[PDB]
Design a protein around this ligand. Structure first.
Ligand SMILES: Nc1ccn([C@@H]2O[C@H](COP(=O)(O)OP(=O)(O)OP(=O)(O)O)[C@@H](O)[C@H]2O)c(=O)n1
Ligand SMILES: [Mg+2]
Ligand SMILES: [Mg+2]
Ligand SMILES: [Zn+2]
Lengths: 50, 1362, 277, 79, 49, 99, 49
DNA sequence: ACGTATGCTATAATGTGTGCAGTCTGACGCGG
């Protein structure tokens, strides 16, 4: 969606944005797995365990 | 409309009547429903003219059929509304009123002329006491105040024969009677008797005022106003709002206060009312008049509706918010638009994106023009609608005019000239401006939400000016430093770095290519990495002895990437330049090289191509910023935990009572400072060479491809200083006060701060950002101050015909040579035949420019010192020559005559300071002070050569130095200065003067956190004026009882021991004094304040022992916040509280008389028979010790040098050498690069006026202080005619004062002090003939500089021709 | 000592006669018959009374020193016309004068736009009627609610309230931030920018070329009627003063000049193009 | 000519007197309707005036001679 | 600034003397100010308002 | 924002400020010194007169641009003519002394 | 605001000094489409005429 | 007649004050 400049980071020293990015990706990774199981129309027990 | 000069004189009551076209006799503004002027009111049309263009009030005469007809009924003329702001009015004051500007604007003026104080005059005005005008009976003399009691005594007793009155009436009669002719002669006679300093000053100033007053033609009665002018109604508007409301200026309200009270006085004078009431009315009238001229001055400013003060007249001429600075020198401008800027990485250097709908509105009259030509528009309202409908064919016409048309792009703030550059607009669909990346540096334009103003150059001359001077391609190098400001950064640098940078084997190592094209072939084919070392056959083109290019073909071992970059590289530069890994600093040399070799065209192309390939390869690589990239120290917790226990150790020693608070404070900073550099280097050592796992056979060591490091190592963004906070330690932050927090920030950005670690980070963060907003005003104000004084300087003559200059020596300081002679004497016309070592053949001539290639031969010959033709050594009256200045560093060859330097110089000086408060103030928060200088180690072998040194051998067997400014040289085989150090006072030398040392040897050693007081004689210590409680204090410990004594200064000292100086007197075994060898000075070292003493009374000492230890607390990051006020003070020429004394004329020193320690000096020169005495403090120590061969201006005392003391004695080239060194010292600390010639400009201007000493052919006489150029033009006619020479002595002037000194009063009032400037100029009756820029920019004429220099001089021959 | 114009005058009145009943009569009896010194005294004496009155007539228009001066003028007119033979005191008679002269002088020099007494006098009764209503309605009265209690016109009440609407000075800062006053915003009505100046110049030069493109008897009659070339803008019937001397033929020839000119605007490229304008 | 104006500064010298010579010539073509010496190739007066100076056709001495050569033709002709 | 009493000292009014001159000041919610201040000769002064 | 010619100030007779009121960009003294440094004299005089106050200049220049003749036609900004009368209203003889 | 897949890397200098390079796909979803509810007004006044 | 202005009222009353009081470095100008 957006392409940011990595040089707007060392000089700035605001590494929280990179952690926001990493966690956001992980969080989305989990949504992408849940999205796939809900599309696949699997099960209540399978979603519950995960 | 075209004039020559502007005059200022005093407004005579008769003169004011000439402008006025009627007398406003009523406060009535307008009628309430009929919105029209009232009968002889403040908006009266019978006085100020008609409302509309050619229309009377009642409506009897209309438009031009009745050209200049005067109506009967209303009595109103039928002219344009033009006259409603031109026509003035007046008011006939019942009783005379005093002018506040000739009473309160100091000098008193009205009181200065009468030889009468303020109080005396005011108590006359407010009717507290009478004043004598002229006593027939010599009983009462003139200007003698009589209280209400004392007036009555003289009335019945003497009376009649004495004339004394009260109020503004009296003082006017006093001014009307006083004779300027007689009291001028009287003062001249009293001057011949016994003249002092203050007496002669007062007399000479009054004398000149009296003569000036007679020659100005002004009469002192006009100080009092019998007539009061009224401002035109349009200039104090009563206009109606859209909402049925009205709005009026505060002047109208202030005017109604004056007229009401004045008319009420007419009424009371009709009634013959008692005087007590008449008094109040007169006091009121004066309050109203003074409030009208300058409201907030005499007393409380009359507040109005919204409890705020009424804006008066003076206020609209006063300062920033006045007409000058706000509505004349600065203007909102047509053909102007501003918008958010964004990147233009596709653009070439001479291009910039301009939105269509922006350029549409901007070029509106150019569309209507090209439209009538094609015949598409018959008229202009037809063309107006064509544009409005935005029809298709109108875009194509707009597109036609814009081609080959430059536009100006400005960014705020406008620091230096490069703050505006011109480009060729490229229409783009979108509301964003697209700017060229390389020139982003000049503006400091960050694409983070910046806006840039656009301006269209209308006139063909403006199109040529914009393309010639203000085009981005013609502006490369900074004017401040001969260095390219146009330089990639960010992505572009990183892309080239990725390309050039090499790696192990990779795909296709050691292969062999036909050309750099086969390298592009293989890389993009996927059978080679940009980091593969392969032999390639490249053919480089090297310039020969002439203009022809020589071709050379050879096998180069580089990388695939380097080979591809050669394609961008023009043929004329060598290949060795792209053979390295390219960084920002390396790239900046590529463009400079390219420029100095090929020229302009090749560079613009090169610049663009560098940018394009930089961006492209920068995105091809795929550099990222992850959290695994910020690698911290593996043993950080190991360094700190044990560096904490280090500080915890001293903390427990302090509470015991040995190491003092100040010594601990400096000692703890040194521990943390070592630990900080320890983490910095161990994190960089584990990051830089982190790729220790290679291949090939087993292993190899290599540079790390850590994303963050590459981005710092290349010199793209951040540095080792920033990475410290990320993976290492944040560092120590700074408080908003200036002191540094004892506890720094331990954590970094990866690990995460705890709750306090962040609270601590705040303290440093807020104070760093507080000095970004508030301190910027001091540096931006300096830019303003510098400019005004350096407005007038323009290159006038080609050759001044002078053979003078300033001996410039290599600036060697801090071991390695800070600034070389080559860079110091680059682009400067040598004012002395400077050849090679062997004096037998001239190498370089006189009138010649030093190009970089001529400076290369200075290296071969190794020049010692050079007399460069300087600015200050110029003889050109009103400006300078191109030879004196030398090269325009921005251009790259000899400066054009007519180019306005002064402004270029001021900008260059103020630009860095002002910018160095936003770059490292928003991203920086951790101070990095590393003042660990404890011992000098010499690096090359040499003989030790000390200068200005007076040392004495100690008990230990070590040469201890007892002189403050000791320097240490390093002399090579042939005999020339290579390295140079500052050895401080009480330093211990390894080897004395003349001895050989080896390389890597500690030649000097001392303690940094202490300033010792060391003796010159051996014996016992005596306590003198060291009474406990008054001057010193005492603190003991336990069992034994070691007590330390701490000397109190005037801050911690009582009124008892104020005149007592505390000193540790030396004595022998008997108890008598010990003479210092070869002087009549009993040994006595004066201890200053807060001086800690360990030896108590009655302790044996040898020579070289430390008596006391003065603490050296200096833990405040100077940066640019606490270093610019030092620059200011220098420029403003402010004497310090400890100036050093210097010898006047050379002779034989002879010590004289004394005053309770205050030393005099009866110097009696060999030739000079008349003695010379000067006084000296007690606590201050000298350098010379009496009876000596002193020369002109030997260093007697130690301390900061007074700039006035330097020029007064050691001439021009000494004070110029001082300011230049002193200023640059502060900027060099910050890495700000400025050519010395720019400072020399301001220096020259600071040497504008000069006091005269000796009577001349002209009526100069003594005490007058005229400009240096004017008096020298008089000396031109004198050496031709003979007559009497006018000897002189040049004076130094501060910036703020040098601006107000110029003969131009317009330039002075436009600056500041505007209330005073005008009053002094009015009384003098001075006429400004306009020479400066500010002067002609105001009137909106051609600037007598730059483009207009050719025009203004063509008008000067109109004057010369008859 | 004392350098405030206020305290200085207030000092000088503090050292001036304080008259008794029969004393006032002694001076006043001689003051009417013109004793000179007598008229000065009664005035000097009762300046202290003027100050106590102007102590409740402040903060309404002018300053305290401005109220005293105009309050002194009331005491003087009271001295010009007092009756000593009457047994009634002076301090009583003088207060009626000092209260009047102050109110009157405030009514003139308070408002920038000089509001005559008549429009003002009325306005006050409208405002003092608003008091009664406001206290019992507990609601700031409307233009109607004031008109219903006086039984007077709606527009009168409204137009009198329009004249009460006070001023904002041009030099006044803007939104608690003196960045710019109203002068740095408020536009100039008279002079329109070059665009509007050249509109008329270009449009009126185009007409000079159109009048020379028509007939001599058509551009004579058409121009001198509208006052384009002639000196006075005449009518169809008034064109007869020159040489036409016709009413029917002037109207046919006026319109004949305009019909040929309407085709000159259709061919050059205006007509409907310049109709919106 | 369009990018560079250094080749034009080479010929005259003063960056300032170049703008004055180029302007005066630009005005002759803009008003008098004089002919361009160099192929105009769809460029405005600005650029063309620089081209003539750059190649060496326009100079301070050249334009002053040419002025009074048209003006002295008028002198002899009138009287 | 909270009403009540407050003790301050200009760490060098006259850096001539360089004497830390101590001063006190009674700040009310409504009313006149009451200040006490020393001088170079340590003479206690009072300056209402 | 963009502006060619529009509203004008009340006394200063220079354009207004901001896109709110359709005003030209301010060219302050710092912006001025930049052109003084370049040497570009007309570009400045152009931004002191025809683009700002000079009432003769602004309208005259407009007419000249649509004619194609981009010709400098200065006169003298109004805001200075104000400053003359303003100093005269303060009781100071300030007249324009001729050649 | 809104979250989205971001990638840190340079791109032909279209992210030079913090400059932003946003996909058309963001613009297609109209996710960054703010709404501005302007409020005009028309006043009938009583002029002298 | 209409709008604006000018005038008088007769208990006695007679010295004011209102309102923000952490700028700051640097430079003279009147008394003391
Ligand atoms: N109070 C301010 C803030 C900003 N600016 C201007 O805006 C520019 C950019 O400020 P900012 O973006 O905050 O700083 P940079 O140095 O660009 O740092 P960063 O890398 O964080 O963008 C400054 O150089 C300056 O020209 C200013 O003049 N005054
Ligand atoms: Mg920015
Ligand atoms: Mg930024
Ligand atoms: Zn009339």
């Amino acid at each position: 969606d957006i392409v940011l400049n990595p040089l707007g980071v060392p000089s700035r020293m605001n590494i929280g944005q990179i952690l926001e990015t990493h966690l956001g990706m992980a969080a989305k990774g989990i949504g992408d797995k849940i999205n796939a199981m809900l599309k696949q129309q699997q099960e209540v027990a399978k979603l519950r365990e995960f | 409309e075209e004039f020559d000069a502007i005059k200022i004189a005093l407004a005579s009551p008769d003169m004011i009547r000439s402008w006025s076209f009627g007398e406003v006799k009523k406060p009535e503004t307008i009628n309430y429903r009929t919105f029209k002027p009232e009968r002889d009111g403040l908006f009266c049309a019978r006085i100020f003219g008609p409302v509309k263009d050619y229309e009377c009030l009642c409506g009897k005469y209309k438009r031009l059929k009745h050209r200049g007809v005067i109506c009967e009924k209303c009595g109103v003329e039928v002219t344009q509304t033009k006259v409603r702001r031109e026509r003035m009015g007046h008011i006939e004051l019942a009783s005379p009123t005093a002018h506040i500007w000739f009473l309160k604007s100091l000098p008193s003026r009205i009181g200065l002329l009468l030889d009468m104080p303020l109080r005396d005059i005011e108590r006359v005005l407010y009717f507290e006491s009478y004043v004598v005008i002229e006593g027939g009976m010599t009983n009462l003399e003139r200007q003698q105040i009589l209280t209400e009691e004392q007036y009555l005594d003289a009335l019945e007793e003497f009376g009649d024969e004495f004339d004394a009155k009260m109020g503004a009436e009296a003082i006017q009669a006093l001014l009307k009677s006083m004779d300027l002719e007689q009291e001028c002669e009287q003062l001249r006679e009293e001057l011949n008797e016994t003249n002092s300093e203050t007496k002669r000053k007062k007399l000479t100033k009054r004398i000149k005022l009296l003569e000036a007053f007679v020659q100005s033609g002004n009469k002192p009665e006009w100080m009092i106003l019998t007539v009061l002018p009224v401002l035109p109604p349009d200039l104090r508007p009563l206009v109606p709002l859209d909402g049925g409301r009205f709005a009026t200026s505060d002047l109208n309200d202030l005017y109604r206060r004056v007229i009401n009270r004045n008319n009420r006085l007419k009424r009371l004078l009709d009634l013959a009312a008692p005087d007590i009431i008449v008094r109040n009315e007169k006091r009121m009238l004066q309050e109203a008049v003074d409030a009208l001229l300058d409201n907030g001055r005499r007393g409380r400013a009359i507040t109005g509706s919204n409890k705020r003060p009424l804006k008066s007249l003076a206020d609209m001429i006063k300062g920033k918010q006045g007409r000058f600075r706000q509505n004349l020198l600065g203007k909102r401008v047509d053909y102007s638009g501003r918008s958010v800027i964004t990147v233009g990485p596709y653009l070439r250097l001479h291009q910039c994106g301009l939105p269509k709908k922006m350029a549409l509105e901007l070029f509106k009259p150019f569309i209507y023009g090209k439209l009538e030509l094609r015949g598409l528009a018959t008229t202009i309202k037809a063309a107006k609608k064509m544009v409005e409908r935005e029809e298709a064919v109108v875009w194509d016409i707009l597109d036609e005019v814009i081609r080959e048309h430059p536009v100006l792009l400005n960014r705020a703030p406008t620091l230096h000239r490069l703050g505006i550059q011109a480009f060729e607009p490229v229409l783009i669909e979108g509301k964003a401006i697209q700017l060229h990346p390389l020139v982003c540096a000049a503006y400091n334009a960050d694409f983070d939400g910046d806006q840039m103003a656009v301006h269209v150059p209308l006139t063909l001359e403006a199109q040529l000016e914009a393309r010639a001077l203000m085009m981005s391609t013609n502006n490369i190098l900074s004017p401040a430093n001969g260095e390219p400001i146009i330089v990639p950064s960010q992505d572009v640098v990183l892309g080239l770095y990725y390309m050039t940078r090499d790696c192990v084997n990779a795909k296709g190592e050691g292969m062999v290519l036909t050309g750099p094209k086969e390298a592009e072939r293989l890389y993009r084919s996927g059978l080679a990495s940009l980091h593969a070392r392969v032999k390639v056959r490249i053919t480089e083109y090297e310039k020969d002895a002439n203009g022809e290019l020589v071709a050379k073909t050879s096998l180069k071992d580089t990388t695939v990437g380097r080979a591809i970059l050669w394609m961008i590289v023009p043929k004329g530069l060598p290949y060795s330049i792209v053979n390295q890994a390219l960084g920002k600093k390396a790239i900046s040399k590529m463009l400079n090289t390219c420029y100095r070799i090929l020229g302009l065209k090749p560079t613009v192309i090169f610049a663009d191509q560098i940018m394009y390939t930089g961006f492209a390869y920068a995105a091809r690589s795929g550099a990222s910023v992850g959290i695994d990239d910020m690698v911290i120290p593996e043993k950080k917790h190991e360094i700190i935990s044990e560096a904490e226990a280090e500080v915890a150790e001293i903390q427990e020693q302090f509470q015991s009572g040995l190491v003092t608070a100040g010594e601990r404070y400096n000692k703890v900073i040194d521990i943390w400072a070592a630990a900080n550099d320890r983490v910095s280097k161990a994190m960089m050592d584990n990051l830089q060479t982190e790729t220790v796992i290679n291949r090939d056979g087993q292993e190899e060591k290599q540079v790390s491809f850590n994303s963050i490091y590459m981005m710092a190592d290349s010199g793209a963004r951040g540095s080792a200083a920033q990475i410290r906070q990320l993976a290492g330690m944040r560092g120590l932050m700074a408080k908003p006060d200036g002191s540094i927090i004892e506890t720094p920030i331990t954590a970094n950005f990866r690990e995460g701060l705890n709750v306090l670690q962040y609270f601590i980070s705040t303290h440093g963060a807020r104070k760093g950002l507080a000095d970004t907003a508030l301190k910027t005003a001091n540096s931006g104000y300096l830019t303003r101050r510098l400019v005004d004084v350096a407005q007038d300087l323009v290159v006038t003559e080609d050759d001044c015909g002078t053979h003078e200059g300033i001996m410039m020596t290599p600036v060697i300081e801090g071991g390695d040579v800070k600034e070389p002679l080559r860079d110091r004497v680059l682009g400067r016309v040598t004012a002395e035949d400077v050849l090679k070592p062997g004096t037998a053949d001239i190498l370089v001539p006189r009138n010649t420019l030093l190009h970089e290639q001529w400076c290369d031969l200075l290296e071969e010959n190794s020049v010692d010192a050079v007399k460069v033709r300087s600015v200050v050594s110029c003889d050109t009256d009103f400006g300078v020559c191109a030879h004196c200045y030398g090269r325009d560093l921005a251009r790259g060859h000899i400066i054009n005559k007519g180019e306005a330097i002064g402004v270029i110089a001021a900008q260059s000086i103020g630009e860095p300071g002002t910018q160095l408060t936003m770059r490292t103030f928003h991203i920086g928060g951790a101070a990095s002070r590393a003042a660990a200088e404890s011992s000098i180690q010499v690096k090359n072998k040499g003989s030790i050569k000390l200068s200005n040194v007076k040392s004495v051998v100690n008990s230990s067997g070590k040469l201890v130095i007892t002189s403050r400014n000791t320097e240490l040289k390093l002399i090579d085989e042939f005999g020339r200065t290579k390295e140079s150090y500052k050895v401080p006072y009480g330093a211990v030398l390894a080897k004395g003067d003349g001895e050989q040392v080896a390389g890597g040897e500690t030649v000097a050693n001392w303690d940094p956190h202490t300033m010792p007081v060391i003796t010159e004689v051996s014996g016992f210590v005596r306590f003198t004026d060291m009474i406990d409680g008054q001057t010193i204090t005492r603190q003991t410990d336990e069992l034994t009882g070691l007590s330390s004594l701490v000397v109190l200064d005037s801050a911690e000292r009582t009124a008892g021991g104020k005149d007592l100086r505390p000193a540790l007197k030396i004595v022998d075994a008997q108890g008598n004094d010990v003479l210092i060898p070869g002087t009549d000075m009993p040994a006595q070292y004066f201890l200053p304040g807060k001086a800690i003493v360990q030896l108590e009374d009655g302790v044996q000492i040898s020579s070289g022992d430390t008596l006391a230890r003065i603490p050296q607390e200096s833990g405040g990051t100077k940066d640019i916040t606490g270093g610019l006020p030092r620059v200011a003070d220098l420029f403003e020429a402010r004497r310090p509280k400890e100036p050093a004394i210097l010898a006047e004329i050379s002779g034989i020193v002879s010590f004289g008389k004394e005053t309770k320690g205050k030393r005099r000096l009866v110097i009696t020169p060999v030739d000079g028979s008349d003695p010379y005495e000067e006084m000296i403090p007690k606590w201050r120590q000298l350098n010379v010790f009496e009876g000596e061969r002193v020369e002109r201006g030997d260093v007697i005392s130690d301390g900061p040098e007074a700039p006035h003391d330097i020029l007064r004695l050691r001439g021009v080239h000494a004070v110029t050498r001082y300011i230049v060194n002193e200023v640059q010292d502060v900027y060099r600390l910050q890495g700000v690069k400025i050519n010395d010639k720019h400072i020399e400009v301001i220096v020259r201007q600071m040497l504008r006026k000069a006091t005269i000493v000796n009577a001349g052919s002209s009526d100069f006489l003594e005490g007058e202080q005229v400009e240096y150029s004017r008096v020298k033009i008089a000396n031109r006619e004198l050496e031709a005619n003979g007559k009497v020479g006018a000897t002189y002595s040049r004076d130094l002037l501060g910036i703020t004062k040098a601006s107000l000194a110029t003969e131009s009063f317009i330039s002075a009032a436009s600056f500041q002090e505007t209330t005073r400037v005008l009053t002094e100029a009015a009384v003098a009756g001075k006429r400004d003939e306009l020479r400066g820029l500010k002067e002609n920019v105001i009137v909106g004429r051609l600037i007598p500089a730059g483009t207009g220099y050719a025009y203004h001089q063509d008008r000067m021959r109109r004057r010369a021709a008859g | 000592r004392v350098l405030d114009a206020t305290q200085l005058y207030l000092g000088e009145i503090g050292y001036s006669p304080l008259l008794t009943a029969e004393e006032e009569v002694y001076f006043a009896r001689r003051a009417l018959r013109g004793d000179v010194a007598s008229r000065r005294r009664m005035i000097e004496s009762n300046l202290r009374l003027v100050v106590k009155i102007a102590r409740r007539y402040g903060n309404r228009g002018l300053a305290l020193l401005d109220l005293i001066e105009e309050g002194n003028l009331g005491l003087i007119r009271a001295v010009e016309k007092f009756d000593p033979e009457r047994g009634f005191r002076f301090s009583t008679y003088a207060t009626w004068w000092i209260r009047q002269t102050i109110e009157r002088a405030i009514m003139n020099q308070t408002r920038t736009i000089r509001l005559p007494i008549h429009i003002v006098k009325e306005l006050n009764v409208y405002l003092r009627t608003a008091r009664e209503l406001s206290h019992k309605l507990d609601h700031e009265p409307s233009a109607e609610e004031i008109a219903e209690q006086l039984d007077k016109p709606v527009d009168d009440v409204s137009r009198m309230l329009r004249l009460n609407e006070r001023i904002t000075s041009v030099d006044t800062p803007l939104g608690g931030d003196s960045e710019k006053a109203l002068l740095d915003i408020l536009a100039d009505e008279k002079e329109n920018g070059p665009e509007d100046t050249t509109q008329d110049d270009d449009m009126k030069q185009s007409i000079v070329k159109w009048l020379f493109e028509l007939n001599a008897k058509q551009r004579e009659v058409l121009a001198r009627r509208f006052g384009l070339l002639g000196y006075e803008a005449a009518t169809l019937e008034d064109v007869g003063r020159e040489i036409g001397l016709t009413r029917e033929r002037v109207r046919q020839i006026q319109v004949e000049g305009l019909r040929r000119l309407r085709e000159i605007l259709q061919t050059q490229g205006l007509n409907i193009e310049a109709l919106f304008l | 000519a369009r990018v560079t104006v250094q080749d034009a500064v080479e010929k005259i010298g003063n960056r300032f007197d170049l703008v004055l010579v180029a302007a005066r010539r630009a005005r002759q073509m803009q008003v008098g309707g004089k002919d361009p010496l160099v192929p105009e190739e769809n460029d405005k007066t600005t650029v063309i005036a620089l081209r003539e100076i750059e190649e060496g056709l326009i100079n301070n001495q050249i334009l002053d001679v040419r002025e009074r050569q048209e003006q002295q033709e008028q002198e002899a002709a009138e009287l | 600034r909270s009403p009540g009493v407050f003790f301050d000292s200009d760490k060098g009014k006259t850096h001539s003397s360089g004497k830390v001159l101590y001063n006190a000041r009674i700040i009310p919610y409504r009313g006149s100010w009451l200040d006490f201040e020393f001088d170079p000769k340590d003479n206690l002064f009072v300056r209402i308002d | 924002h963009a502006r060619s010619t529009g509203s004008y100030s009340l006394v200063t007779q220079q354009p207004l400020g901001g896109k709110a009121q359709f005003g030209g960009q301010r060219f302050g003294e710092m912006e001025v010194w930049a052109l003084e440094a370049y040497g570009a004299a007309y570009t400045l005089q152009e931004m002191l007169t025809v683009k700002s106050d000079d009432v003769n200049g602004r309208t005259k220049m407009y007419k000249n641009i649509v004619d194609g003749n981009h010709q400098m036609e200065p006169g003298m900004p109004e805001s200075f003519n104000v400053l003359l009368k303003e100093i005269r209203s303060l009781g100071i003889n300030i007249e324009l002394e001729d050649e | 605001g809104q979250n989205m897949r971001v990638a840190f890397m340079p791109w032909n200098g279209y992210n030079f000094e913090d400059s932003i390079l946003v996909s058309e796909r963001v613009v297609q979803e109209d996710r960054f489409t703010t709404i501005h509810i302007q409020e005009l007004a028309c006043v009938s006044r009583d002029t002298k005429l």
